[PDB]
């Protein structure tokens, strides 16, 4: 399954999202070795990850080694797959000396054009919020397409400061005119960070993106993906 993701070629008949281009996940002169279930594949800035072989609506885990070949960091690489979007994250564990950090990699998919959004109606999205050592968060998000605004909330994470509101924010076009919502994160009604979600799918079926929550210990990343039911 994980091994098939690493070894199999694409399969037009596999459940989308079929592929994900690794960009942020592996920079210009890096190589990213992913391993699971006995298999290994190396990428490849620009390279495609065969997400078609992975289970939808779950986090798939691989061991990773990021290199430039000399090893910089290793830990666990996480991929969350929906039908029209997916994202990746890295749980660094070693750099060898124990040292942990969780950071989002790529947020990818078939972006919904800002110029081709639904003209009205209210959509509710339900999915997962995942952060360090915790893929059990629940994301609820609502978009009003008449107002072109979205809002939502993250619940059920073990770390109390990550259970935040995703405050109302406008949908805007990004540099490619993809529809994105960038807004404020609230903790006990007060701002403590920022979030960004892209809208994905021809009919805006999905959202995916991340939140960054400021703590006294640094910024914590939460990966976000939800879909209309």
């Amino acid at each position, epitope marked *: 399954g994980l091994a098939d993701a690493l070894t199999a070629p694409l399969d037009h008949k596999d459940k989308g999202l079929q592929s994900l281009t690794l960009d942020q996940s592996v*920079r210009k002169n890096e190589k990213l070795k992913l391993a699971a279930q006995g298999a290994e594949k190396t990428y490849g800035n620009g390279d495609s990850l065969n997400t078609g072989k992975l289970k939808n609506d779950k986090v798939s885990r691989f061991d990773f080694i990021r290199q430039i070949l000399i090893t910089l960091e290793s830990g666990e690489f996480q991929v969350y797959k929906q039908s029209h979007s997916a994202l990746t994250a890295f749980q660094t564990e070693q750099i060898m000396v124990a040292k942990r950090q969780f950071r989002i990699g790529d947020i990818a998919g078939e972006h919904t054009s800002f110029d081709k959004l639904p003209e009205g109606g209210r959509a509710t999205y339900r999915g997962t919020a995942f952060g360090s050592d915790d893929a059990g968060g629940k994301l609820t998000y609502t978009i009003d397409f008449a107002a072109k605004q979205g809002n939502g909330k993250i619940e059920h994470l073990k770390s109390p400061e990550l259970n935040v509101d995703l405050a109302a924010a406008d949908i805007k076009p990004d540099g490619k005119r993809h529809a994105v919502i960038s807004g404020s994160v609230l903790y006990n009604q007060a*701002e*403590k960070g*920022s979030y960004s979600l892209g809208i994905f799918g021809g009919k805006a079926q999905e959202v995916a993106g991340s939140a*960054e929550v400021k*703590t*006294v*210990n*640094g910024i914590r990343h939460i990966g976000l993906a939800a879909k209309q039911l």
Partner: antibody
Amino acid sequence: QVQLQESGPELVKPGASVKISCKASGYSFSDYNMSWVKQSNGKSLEWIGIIDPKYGTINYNQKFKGKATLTVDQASSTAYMQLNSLTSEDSAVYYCVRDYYGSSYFDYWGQGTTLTVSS
Amino acid sequence: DIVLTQSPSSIYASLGERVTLTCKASQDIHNYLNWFQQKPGKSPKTLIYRANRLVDGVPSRFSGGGSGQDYSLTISSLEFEDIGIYYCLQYDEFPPTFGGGTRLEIKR
């Protein structure tokens, strides 16, 4: 009237302790973190530590643990930094700095407090 | 701790010239970078956060860029009030750490 107004310059002997204040006005003090920064010789800058005034959580740069203690008084909207066991290496200008943007920690700065430790 | 380095350490430029300052981190800092400007005897002033976001009210002649380890601050057209020392800082991994500064001075 300026948002972060620090206490005046201090001149003390080695071995002494000082407590520097940073009085907040014009914004919601409890809703924003306050950090402290050391600038030595008008050049090199270092981050000392940060405190969340609402929740009381603190993080110290390891290098300053046992040198600096951060506290706040929410009722008077004042942040404090106490520096203990002073030596000449503690002579510097100290700044309080609050955050303002959701993805930044260091957005508006106090006017600075000069500390001189000398015998 | 992450190490931040700034080059060059001094820049001389004429009024109206384009100036670019550089900053490099010892590891990927995920765009969590500030730029501060400091005049003599004054406190630092934040100009950029998150590597490329302009602080409210900062003149549009300033802009931040970069990713991974390599960042820059560019002033499109140097003005006299821009003279001072510029520092970068990363806040991706605590403790936040500052670069050593680049002084911007006037050619004559």
